[PDB]
């Protein structure tokens, strides 16, 4: 046991909600299209990757007596007798994203989801965590909650608990982008556009002055008029005016592009995926996105699962439509291994997502020799 | 024993925390998003690399009697009876990053984590280190704590104690970038936009003047108007004004890009990882990131581990999704090695992350000979 | 940073002058205002001022890049290692760094 755990409790007795302003985040996700699309692709991608359970670690875990097949079916087919697999996975991933942490309940035989927007974790004076408090009055325990924590540095010191919300960091950038974009719309709806100013030093009958004003407006526009010369009489003067604040000054494109690139940067999506990319970009960018962004996100979940159940669980995609291996190269390398005897044919079948055959000559290596 | 160790202790009796301002760093991590993404990539990438324990060094280390398999389980499956593997690695790496150093406690059988933001190291007049003081009154020892130090040159002389926090070098750049970015939104919300400036040397009825100023603004906006000509009567003049301080002057984009490269440079992540890259950019840049940045960072940890336990521990990834070898090239070199008899087939499978199979012909080198 | 410089050759009650200054500031900003034309009465003029020392003059970026290259030069680290490199850039530069430095 850790002799310094009680000081850890004293320095942070309870978890801290990190999505400091939730309503602004919800408003932006609802009515801002870069956050909407980026969060949607991240969550949907973290919902397509299947989980493959491995061997049993001969250790004591919080959940014991669960067989491999039951865990596999509840984790890849249907978690709860009442809820979907993709819905539950998306809920967990969106809790991990929009909130710092993500929480999953564990019944006797079913694996329920609990939102992290209301749960608060209370540290223990002795071990690691005393008891979770969902909103209030729940008081789950610890053996029945799967804890997913995204790394955080909140307040002075990092925390054994809680988590820092990825979406909560882009709120300032989203507000800046929205204000900067609304400024152009209001500038267009407000700024005045004129084509000609005439001046006279004597008052000339406001009614008739206005009538001549619309006469000049309609008559000297090539779409609706067929005149191009003015003969000003009586000393009326034409002031050579200029435009005060032209639209060319408001060059917000570069700043808006910077804000968009930053927002795509925080979630981790490459900018090429949202745009159109060449053949040299699409496959490497899909690989970079999925692996280096999502697979940490799912690795947190799978590590928490292998802590909770003791079964080695890893994010093994091998089936997502975005990372389907190149058929020619994959076939070439699998055939090379099969011919040269490194792997059996059945393993190649398993890699090709086929089903192994109960054949004799395939279950043993070829060993070409001669 | 070192004759000069007492002078070393006299020149620096105790360690000193190097993250001089923790709260500003926390607020930057929580509300500045380039820093969030860079730190998250570094920490998560430093949490995916598995650890392989090698042989036993016949030396007297601080931890004795620990079995190889028990150390492997503690270091790759479950460090604690109460906390995860990914969470533990993430805490250790974020302590190494945001603070200068990182500390890991060691019970008889459990390998607990302790924060480095609170704990101070006291040098020894004779050997190396008297003890470790966690805030106070705990007073761990040295025989039971694992010490991971990031190289530092603080004050006049470099220290065998303490350490330099990489993030603390970035706070000034973060403040500069935040101020520079806030200046643009404040300039937009504060600057004035004018369409016309009409003057008269005599007073024209403020109420009716304001009514005409609303009518004249709404009438000459082509979105909401059907007039474009002015007939100024009574001697009212139109001053040919010009915009005083246009927005085109504030060319902050290059400065903000410089500050973004500022933020990313200190952590070590290449700028291509954040953006999109070609076939020739993604995998080489991920290789640079992992190797050059992370693997020294985990090499500090593994060197401290091999000091503590005496077992050769190295960061052996071989499984991280972002460094999966090219299937075709990997197949080609493995098959060539197997055919030409340099390595056995079983160790080829081992390098393929599969399970070696107990065969008679495969356990020996093929020896092509003819 | 200034938007307007309106001038008057007579004194006009500092308190209300400041009040109208604030009102005309807030009114003629499209973000927080819904007006774009200004009618000046009483002989008040509008001086066509200009920006004295614009931020565009301070082009420090090239000098700052030179200083960064100079700092990275003394230690020996190639500039490609810190940035992103292609297949042709990255491994020869890692080799040059390790070996030569």
Residue numbers in the entry:
A (entry chain J), B (entry chain K): 11 to 380
C (entry chain L): 203 to 303
Question: What's the paper's own text on this?
Answer:
Bacteriophage T5, a representative member of the T5-like family of siphophages, serves as an excellent model for studying the assembly, infection, cell wall perforation, and DNA ejection mechanisms of this phage family. In this study, we used cryo-electron microscopy (cryo-EM) to determine the structures of mature T5 (a laboratory-adapted, fiberless T5 mutant) and urea-treated empty T5 (lacking the tip complex) at near-atomic resolutions. The T5 head comprises 775 copies of MCP gp8, arranged into 11 pentons and 120 hexons, forming an icosahedral shell with a triangle number (T) of 13. The T5 tail, which comprises 40 trimeric rings of the TTP and a distal tip complex, is connected to a unique five-fold vertex of the head by the connector complex.
We built atomic models for the portal, adaptor, and tail terminator of urea-treated empty T5. In contrast to the mature T5, the DNA and TMP are ejected in urea-treated empty T5, resulting in an empty head and an unoccupied tail tube. The release of the TMP and DNA in urea-treated T5 results in an empty tail and an empty head. A structural comparison of the connector complex between the two states revealed that the connector did not undergo any global conformational change. Structural comparisons of the portal, adaptor, and tail terminator proteins before and after DNA release indicated that no discernible conformational changes had occurred in these regions during infection. In the DNA-ejected state, once the interaction of the tail tip complex or baseplate with the host cell induces the release of TMP, the large space of the connector complex enables the passage of DNA. No significant differences were observed in the conformation of connector proteins before and after DNA release, and these proteins appear to be conserved across myophages and siphophages. However, T5 and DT57C lack a stopper in the connector complex, suggesting that the dodecameric adaptor may assume the stopper function, serving as a docking platform for the tail by binding to the tail terminator protein and ultimately completing the formation of the connector complex. Notably, the tip complex of the empty particle became detached for urea-treatment-induced reasons.
